[PDB]
Amino acid sequence: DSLAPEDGSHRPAAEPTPPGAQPTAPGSLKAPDTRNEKLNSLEDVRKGSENYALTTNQGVRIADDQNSLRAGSRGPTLLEDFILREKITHFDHERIPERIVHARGSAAHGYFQPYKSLSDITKADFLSDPNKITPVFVRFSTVQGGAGSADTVRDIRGFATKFYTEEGIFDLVGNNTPIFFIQDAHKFPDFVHAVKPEPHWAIPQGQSAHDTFWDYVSLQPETLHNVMWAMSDRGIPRSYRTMEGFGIHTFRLINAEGKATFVRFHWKPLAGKASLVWDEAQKLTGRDPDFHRRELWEAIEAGDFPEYELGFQLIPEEDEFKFDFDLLDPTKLIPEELVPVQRVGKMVLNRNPDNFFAENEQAAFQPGHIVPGLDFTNDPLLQGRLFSYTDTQISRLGGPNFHEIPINRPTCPYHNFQRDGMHRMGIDTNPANYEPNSINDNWPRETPPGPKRGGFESYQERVEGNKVRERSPSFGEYYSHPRLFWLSQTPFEQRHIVDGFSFELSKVVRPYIRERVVDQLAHIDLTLAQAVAKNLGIELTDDQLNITPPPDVNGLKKDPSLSLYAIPDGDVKGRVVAILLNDEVRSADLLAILKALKAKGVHAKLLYSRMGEVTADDGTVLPIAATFAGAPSLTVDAVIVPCGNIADIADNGDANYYLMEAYKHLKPIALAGDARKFKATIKIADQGEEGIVEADSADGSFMDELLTLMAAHRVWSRIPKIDKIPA
Amino acid sequence: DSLAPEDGSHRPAAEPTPPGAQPTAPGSLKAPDTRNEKLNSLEDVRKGSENYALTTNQGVRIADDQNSLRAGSRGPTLLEDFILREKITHFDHERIPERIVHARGSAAHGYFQPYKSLSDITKADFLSDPNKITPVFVRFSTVQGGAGSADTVRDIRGFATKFYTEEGIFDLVGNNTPIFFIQDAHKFPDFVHAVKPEPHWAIPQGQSAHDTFWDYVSLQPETLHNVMWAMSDRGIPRSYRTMEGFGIHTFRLINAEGKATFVRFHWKPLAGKASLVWDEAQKLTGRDPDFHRRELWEAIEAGDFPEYELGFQLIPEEDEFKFDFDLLDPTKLIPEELVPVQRVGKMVLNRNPDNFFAENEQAAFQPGHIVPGLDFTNDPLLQGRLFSYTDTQISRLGGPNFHEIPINRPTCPYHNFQRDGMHRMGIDTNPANYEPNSINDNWPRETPPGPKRGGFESYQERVEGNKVRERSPSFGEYYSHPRLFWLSQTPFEQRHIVDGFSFELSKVVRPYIRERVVDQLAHIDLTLAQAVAKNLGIELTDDQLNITPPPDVNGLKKDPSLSLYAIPDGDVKGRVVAILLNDEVRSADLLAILKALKAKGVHAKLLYSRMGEVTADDGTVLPIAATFAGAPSLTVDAVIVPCGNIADIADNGDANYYLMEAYKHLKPIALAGDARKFKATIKIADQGEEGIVEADSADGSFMDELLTLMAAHRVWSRIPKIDKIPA
Ligand code: HEM
Ligand code: HEM
Fold first, then answer.
1. Same structural domain for residues B536 and B586?
2. Where is this region: Disordered (chains A, B)?
3. Using omega within 30 degrees of 0 as the cis cutoff, is the peptide bond preceding B436 cis?
4. Which residues of A596-634 are buried (b: 16+ CB within 10 A; e: fewer)?
5. Of A307, A179, A160, nearest in space to A242 by CA
6. Is B389 among the annotated ligand-binding positions?
7. H helices then E strands: how many in chain A?
8. What are phi and psi for residue A470, nearest 5 degrees?
9. Counting beta carbons within 10 angstroms of the beta carbon of residue B543, is it exposed (0 to 12), middle (13 to 18) or buried (19 or more)?
10. Is A175 a catalytic site residue?
11. What residue ranges in B55-184 does DSSP mark as E strands?
């Protein structure tokens, strides 16, 4: 009929807008001018809608899409209704298997560019010229939960990048911690079954806090290093934009002269490192289970494009055996104090998908998708990964032609003698389907390895030894990396780690499992083990108290790059502030606040006890984004309460609780004029306290002080005072 | 090695135990003596584990399950490692598509028995004899969310029962509200797409609070009736045990003389009707997303078997057109004040599955699976559901032999000429695979219809009309049932409905959609429409204030059976109380508390600020179930605080917040002796208050007062006092 409002407010503007201002939309409608080579080549399968008639899949126009065909208007539905049958049949077959791990993830389009040619160390074409732009598709994810599970759970995060190079797709499939839990791929199903929901009753979702995980951990001390990262605030990032990414494994770079250099891949977040606190994270899984997916999408619609710097840890072939740990051991990190990360290039994510299922759900990444100029190593966890991804994609994506699903397609040429398979789109005209052949003059043809555009040839590593099912003895050390990680954390980080283990072990029903984990912690560090044991009402024995700590890692007693917060790297752009309105806001405060926020690229959400609008003291009509209950403090980075008629919200339960929740979760709070009445809610001294901005009006230094607090992310000095707060 | 602790504390006892006392376990280990015919037939495919060697799927014993085979202990993995490849391959192919709708669900085994022979109204064999037991498998579910989404979301709940009868499987596939949102199956994909996560970004999960849903509802007023149920507290049940179930459609009962009687199916919860409150429910999705799944499984492990009474609404064929609504319109309920529910039988769920995936995830139910003695009607929603479930099961469960998956197998005989298909288990020996045949003497053979054990023959309904895609005119009335439902609710239920709509519409980004829904509410009831409008800062126009309310439904101005609470039906057995311990618990309080809870079958959970144990005044060692933060008040039905050393917990933030949360969520709280000092936390009268139990000790009348409050579920009279509490 007539459905759209005549004012056109059903359609968001095709320009960058702040989170919550307009309805979000498919990338190609929201930002039609953001292009790259991959986004342009997807154009052939994009479908429009406006001005077209509604049809069946065979192109037959539909006259009545409200009713089934029946014998009389109160009669039985007829089998001849082919329109009903196609529509319900397509619906009936919508779902495909979710990924076995990392089923929950959010993705975006972008591009990569190197800072300079890396020709001296790799012949990889995407890294050979600073002007050569590589389109990318990135998917961020959790590990354990299903596709419908929550975003802000405590878990490891996946960070997978598909590089559409001129010499093939290269997938860099990494996580947000520099190590993995296990050493050999043969134990992957064991580890994953232990962390996933328990088999009898399929509980719990999105959580390692259960008996089978901690049972496996207590029996397999190789897991301890990644367990420490997961128990830290690393396991609950603030956003996919404020976390690090790592390839984990040592791989090789191969240059045109055939020299191999060992490399570990890193992604540095240009928005800085930032995490939530447990209580906030857990509650956020209920108030907004789509928080990371939403935040990513809206940051891109706002122009706060996630930006990451690609970095390399490089190690010469001759230094393979010079560390205290094996470089091929994926439970071991390479300390940046020993081997610095050399900056390589920048990746910018600047457009969302059009259809989540078609581009995100069907996207397929594989660590075995390498290009000439890169090569593998014998890391036994990576070695097993090379089998698994192609295998899993035959069932998940329905056959061996998953490279022909649009998002997965190479933008460079691909020709070979592979034919058929379910859902074959490519129609081959080659008279031959084999080589060598004479009937097509042997095309397509093999190509010798060489400096550029040559064929792939493996680096000729020497192999020597017997066929054995055996762990390398060099991998047999499990506590020095966990201890290095612990000692590099700030004191408040250490407390968060203690609390993570305490919370998680308190959900393990069999007490002996909690005792065995505590015994393993006692081999890492006694201060950690005692504080966890005390929260579990466990007392360490005299021999646990005398376990000798593991040695330092190559002499290091700490490495500050392992901490999220020890070295300041805060960036306020793309953060958000809740502004608690009243029914007669002092407009001078609001202008000061909103303009200061705008100058640093910080967003605001105007909150009230109802929707609609309120009128400021000078007649300005203020549109309300959400209620106090509808957009909790959990969703924002800070809270500002301007002056006005404070008696309007002074006794609102939700308004007060908003401040108590943001105060408990260490966020900066700013109170202007009579808004300082709320200081009694959060029991704050008369004289003031660090972390609380207060003044007669929201004017000169007020906003600079609030922005400085925001730059430091959270008010860690408040931790000892929040334990009293009933919130 | 390895082992299990020497004390055997890794294994749960095989007898009924209370929630949280022991680790949960597969049903055939937890309750080995619980049997039924279905449970016994599944024993052919059950696998043990104890005392068996670890093998490949081909039966080859494995010597080293910790390592891949490599050329040297630090070398590359070899392709000949068939043990590793089978192991990772099985793992890679674990997942199958989730259900298009109702993907999130929890199931259990049990049995059904009729109260008396229904042979006068139906020839259905499972209802023919009060001593004939029919094994059942029941799956309860949400609608919108994925299999990894949360349990206590606001949504409709599915309630599917598989009856393993002697004359075939009957599946009664119902929901927890007596109507559906739409009238014709042709709109199903339209409605489901609108409620599901939005296609560009796949948000939000498990929620109807978003623009597409409310856009659809505002344009399709036939949805309003189920929308009203969804926005009430019926959308957030306390448990699958405390909700109703309904077949929704009008079906038919066919007796041995060929008479048809119209029937609507009902399930009455013998644990009573009870729901959560929104804040509690939404927070619970984050604190425990598996709450309903967990509480069902634990109720069965505790002997609190979910029990339901099957009930029929019976309408003679001559009364088909005597209501003011069409009987075949699934957006219309049949008020119990006009056609009472006649008791039919009882269903008891007394055993959990062994393996969630094998039995719950692969279970397939179909409303098309009826048996002689039942038949369909021309309800156009039902009619299209007869096509869809078999269709969807061919891809979900991989082929046409889904009836051979163990959970789905009939326990009565099945023989026919169908052959082959993917994963065919049955091996047919019949020389013939067609009929009529002479080579097998025509077996298996057709069987004429008759009074018992006869072939199926459809009731010969008269059909007359033209081939039309047309909605019956009698279905074009959309507001009288929504209004009957509203007027039947108590004042607090009405407020909860107002708040549900207000919260949901507040998340609708496009304001004109909110305005359009408000306009539809004004056609239902003006008080409802204005209270929602006010929460959205919308003002009804003069025209909207003059819309005439729809007429009463056949003279009814209300029907108390439509309310959750107007008619008391409380049952405390299976409910749970939190007991907040201190380090010197007055043991006489605890004894009195525990004995009285035990006498009514109410469970307790001992909470403390840490795990481990505390010792009571009398030296009794009390093991701690969880901490205050680890098992929030959200998860219990009431809170008791016994006397002792109150100073230990008086300034504990979590302990104070525990009571504030419980108080806000209207739960009964009981305070003994010095625990009455917590009356200041919840700001309430020095003199006492209805809903708060208090005394010098936890003595005689203290526990009776607590248990009386619990039997009324929630303290509805405290609603006016909770909106000041900051919690
Ligand atoms: C350093 C260790 C590992 C890392 C960093 C890692 C990372 C990831 C990531 C980020 C994804 C999701 C990709 C996406 O968004 O689609 C993924 C998926 C997957 N991983 Fe790995 N993984 C590791 C180890 C393993 C191992 C040892 C195996 C098995 C041998 C494995 C098997 C899989 C499978 C089967 C999938 C699903 C792929 C699909 O369906 O396309 N992973 N992994
Ligand atoms: C009164 C209306 C309806 C009710 C009470 C209802 C109820 C249910 C329930 C309870 C389930 C889940 C069964 C389980 O636990 O496995 C289900 C699944 C399903 N429903 Fe319905 N439904 C209704 C309408 C429809 C309609 C109109 C269609 C399509 C025309 C439909 C298509 C499906 C499909 C495809 C599934 C998944 C089945 C499977 O994968 O095995 N439903 N429905």
1. no
2. 433-467
3. yes
4. bbeebebbbbbbbbbbbebebeeeeebebbbbbbbbbbb
5. A307
6. yes
7. 18, 20
8. -150, 135
9. exposed
10. yes
11. 69-71, 105-114, 134-141, 158-165, 168-175
Which residues 6+ apart lie within 8 Å of B596 measured at CB? B703, B704, B706, B707
**Two tokens at A127?**
């890294």
Eight-state DSSP code of residue B360: I
- Note whether A645 and A705 are same-domain residues: yes
**Distance in Å, CA A185 to ligand 2 centroid:** 40
**Do the strands B105-114 and B168-175 form a parallel or antiparallel pair, or are they unpaired?**
unpaired
Residue B649: both structure tokens together: 């917990």
What residue numbers bound the domain in which A605 lies?
A: 574-727
> Considering only alpha carbons, which residue of chain A is nearest residue B658?
A726
CB of A352 closer than 6 angstroms to any ligand 1 atom: no
Whether A507 and B630 have beta carbons less than 8 Å apart is answered as yes
Residue located via tokens 């047999």: A476
Helices (H), B397-464: none
- Asked if A188's CB is within 8 angstroms of B84's CB, the reply is no
CATH number of the CATH domain containing A479 = 1.20.1370.20
- What's the half-sphere exposure (Cβ side, CA atoms, 13 Å) at A555? 3
Give SS3 for B348. Answer: strand
Residue A463 lies in a domain: no
Here the contacts of A512-518 (C-beta below 8 Å, separation 24 or greater) are A512/B5, A512/B7, A512/B9, A512/B10, A513/A211, A513/A214, A513/A215, A513/A218, A514/A214, A514/A538, A514/B611, A516/A218, A516/A219, A517/A214, A517/A217, A517/A218, A518/A544
Sign of CA dihedral B624, B630, B636, B642: positive
Closest CA relative to residue A481, chosen from A183, A226, A268: A226
Question: Residue B289 falls within a domain, yes or no?
Answer: yes
Distance from CA of A541 to the nearest CA of B (A): 16
Give the up-direction half-sphere exposure of residue A318: CA atoms within 13 A in the CB hemisphere.
Answer: 1
Contact, A159 vs A245, CB < 8 A? yes
Nearest atom (ligand 2) to Cα of B387: 30
Ligand 1: does its nearest atom lie under 6 Å from the Cβ of A264? no
To the nearest whole Å, the CA of B625 is away from the closest chain A CA by 9
- Residues in chain B with CB shorter than 8 Å from the CB of A290 are 203-205
Best mutation site among A96, A99, A169, A193 for ligand 1, i.e. most ligand atoms within 8 A of its Cβ?
A99
φ and ψ of B275, to 5 deg? -125, 165
What Cα–Cα distance (Å) separates residue B106 from each residue in B140, B352, B392, B556?
A: 5, 10, 20, 37
| Alpha-carbon span B407 to B422, nearest angstrom | 18
Q: CA-based Rg of chain B, rounded to a whole angstrom?
A: 28
Preceding amide of A431 cis, omega within 30 = no
Determine the Cα–Cα distance for residues B494 and B500; give it in Å rounded to an integer. 10
Contact A289 B87 (CB under 8 A): no
Method used experimentally: X-ray
Please, which residues have CB within 8 angstroms of residue A152's CB and are 6 or more apart in sequence?
Answer: A236, A276, A281, A282, A284, A285, A289, A291, A292
What does A585-616 look like in DSSP terms, one character per residue? --HHHHHHHHHHHHHHT-EEEEEESSSSEEE-
Q: Please identify, among B410, B435, B457, the residue that sits at the C-terminal boundary of a domain.
A: B410
b/e map of A254-288 (b: 16 or more CB within 10 Å)? bbbeeebbbbbbbbbbbbbbbbbbbbbbbbbbbbb
Matching residue, tokens 């294994």: B11
Shared domain for B509 and B589, answered yes or no, is: no
What resolution does the deposited structure have, in angstroms? Answer: 2.2
